[PDB]
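step 4 of 6: structure.
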Amino acid sequence: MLNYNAPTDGQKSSIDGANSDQMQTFFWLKKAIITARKEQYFMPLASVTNM
Amino acid sequence: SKLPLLTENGGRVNRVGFTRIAREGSIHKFGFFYEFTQESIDFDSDDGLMEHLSRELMNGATQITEAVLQKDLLAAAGTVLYAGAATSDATITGEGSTPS
Amino acid sequence: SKLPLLTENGGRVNRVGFTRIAREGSIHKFGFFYEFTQESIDFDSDDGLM
Amino acid sequence: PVLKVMFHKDTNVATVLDASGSLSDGSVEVGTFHHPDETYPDSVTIYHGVRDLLYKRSAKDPSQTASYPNNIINMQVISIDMKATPRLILGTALPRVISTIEGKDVTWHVDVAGGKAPLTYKWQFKANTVGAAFADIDSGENPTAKTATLINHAVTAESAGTYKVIVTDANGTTIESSSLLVVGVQEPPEVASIVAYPSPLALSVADDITDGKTVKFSSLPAGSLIGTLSIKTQPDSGKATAEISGNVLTVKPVAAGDTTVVVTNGTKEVTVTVNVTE
């Protein structure tokens, strides 16, 4: 039977020959994890004097 | 001997498989430029110097591309034959009993 | 010691850079089944066994 | 290689020399840099390095340094002169993977230009079996080994492996290219024996318990298929612990004691010696 096997870990799918290998072995989500900016406490305290 | 044949009671008597092969290629970058001053353009007798220069640049670029393609095709020949009794590039000679 | 400081004539003074990281996950498969015969359903004492 | 840069203020000419070389034309040494740059070999060239070195020195006196408005930042007037040893350029590289069936002819061609004539070519071959090392192709048996083009006739299972070409000149500049040959056989020969790399003698000796050794296996008969390997734990698990994932075998030494592990595919077994030192 034509089996998928596991392209990772050195095994190969049956249809794939000695030379070939799978083009796409994973899916890229395209949505990135981001970190929010830190909070500030001392800045709101200050009063601004025009120069 | 290896003909595929079926009886009336066809069961599991023939089976075949398939394979695929992969190829690849890469990309490179080229370029060139030239400089000029304003007086060379403004005081020259030829009115259309810029057109001529741009056309020459484009023609040179096309010629360079063609030369690179030709050398890449030569480098990737599948089978190489040497004329005469020569067996290698260093062996190829035009003097002797058997010229190449 | 390490503060971004500029003079009036500032050229190529402070540079920075960035980095990214990658993660992954996978999928698996499960299953089970059971069998019976028609007489077991037809002649059983209890209706609604299925 | 490291290049030295000399600057002459009057003629606005920057000279690039070797480390040993020097000039007596009134030029002032500004600095040195690595040409391959060791981190981005293809991104940068001589011009960028010379510009970066000249950015620091002052215009009035090239010997002294200065801030931004007073540097040497106009590279249009500056002309760079090269006196160092030329570097070889690889016009054409060998294809990464070449695939063929047994009983066919395969040809490799590499193009190299630059440097000082005449060029010299050497070809080396490395087998797929673990532990193989680059051995020179005999020139007498194969006349094409000396030349750029290498032709091998009637390839078999043993012919599979990586091939490398080495180019040298009178000066001594050297560049190399590598290629891989894959040969498919209709009927794979049966496995006869199995050998190991990073040696079955002592493996990798690490005093730290956390460090884990890596082991690889292969079969001596060329073209033979090796089945999935399984490991048999042996008497001293306290001395070391072995776990196998596919062909790769990892060993973590819990205690400083020598042990032996046997790994089998179901028909043949491999005897590997493990040495642990405190």
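step 5 of 6: annotate
 - The two ends of chain D are 41 Å apart (CA to CA).
 - The CA atoms of residues 187 and 223 of chain D lie 9 Å apart.
step 6 of 6: archive
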